[PDB]
């Protein structure tokens, strides 16, 4: 019944500041420390520190001192981690976790992207083929967007098997991503196959039907 909810993905410029929230539900907020953990791409976990909600007691373990400040609002059962003087070294996924010696309850993670790159909507292109191989593989190219993330679905989520949505790749301040969907040859072009791309950062929702060339 315990669950920590963190704030969403954040994009901020270097030198700027960001505040990440962590709301705890399911226990007496002020009786447990809230832990903050940093994790970079395919790297290990780094304990940033902790704060005891309702006591303002804290322990800081961040690399560059003074850039991290923890606060908590016992009134809203929410703890916060504010990162200031942001640099690229701060881009990472930050987790919140209840302090139980071990960490059993974790937040879902909040991804921070430190960059001066401007938010840009994605361009979505249908990837139509030429049973081609028992099944036929279709795809959607999602390029020129910023920042992460983008969520891709096929036929509004009705198609998940045979779907491969690849991690985006950054290039010149613009992310490019693609997703492939392998369906039986009888299903397409017989039945419609559509990829749905959403990029909240730019209030962008695109539906690109995969039509035969």
């Amino acid at each position: 019944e315990v669950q920590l909810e963190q704030s969403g993905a954040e994009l901020m410029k270097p030198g700027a500041s960001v505040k990440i929230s962590c709301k705890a539900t399911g226990y007496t907020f002020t009786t447990y420390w809230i832990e903050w953990i940093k994790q970079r791409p395919g790297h290990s976990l780094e304990w940033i520190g902790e704060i005891l909600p309702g006591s303002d007691s804290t322990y800081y373990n961040e690399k560059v001192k003074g850039k991290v400040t923890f606060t908590a609002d016992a009134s809203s059962n929410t703890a916060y981690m504010q990162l200031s003087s942001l640099t690229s070294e701060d881009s990472a996924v930050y987790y919140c976790a209840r302090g139980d010696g071990f960490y059993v309850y974790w937040g879902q993670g909040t991804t921070l992207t430190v960059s001066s790159a401007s938010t840009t909507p994605p361009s979505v292109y249908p990837l139509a083929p030429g049973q081609t191989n028992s099944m036929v593989t279709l795809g959607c190219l999602v390029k020129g967007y910023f920042p992460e993330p983008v969520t891709v679905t096929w036929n509004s989520g009705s198609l998940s098997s045979g779907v491969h949505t690849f991690p985006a790749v950054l290039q010149s301040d613009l992310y490019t991503l693609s997703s492939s969907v392998t369906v039986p040859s009888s299903p397409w072009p017989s039945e419609t196959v559509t990829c749905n791309v959403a990029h909240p950062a730019s209030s962008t929702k695109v539906d690109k039907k995969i039509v035969p060339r």
């Binding site: 361009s123 292109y125 249908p126 990837l127 139509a128 083929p129 191989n133 593989t137 795809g139 190219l141 492939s180 392998t182 060339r213």
Partner: peptide, 12 residues
């Protein structure tokens, strides 16, 4: 690997 190659879309 099952390889599939896609030319640029008319749209792009």
């Amino acid at each position: 690997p099952t390889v599939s190659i896609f030319p640029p879309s008319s749209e792009q």
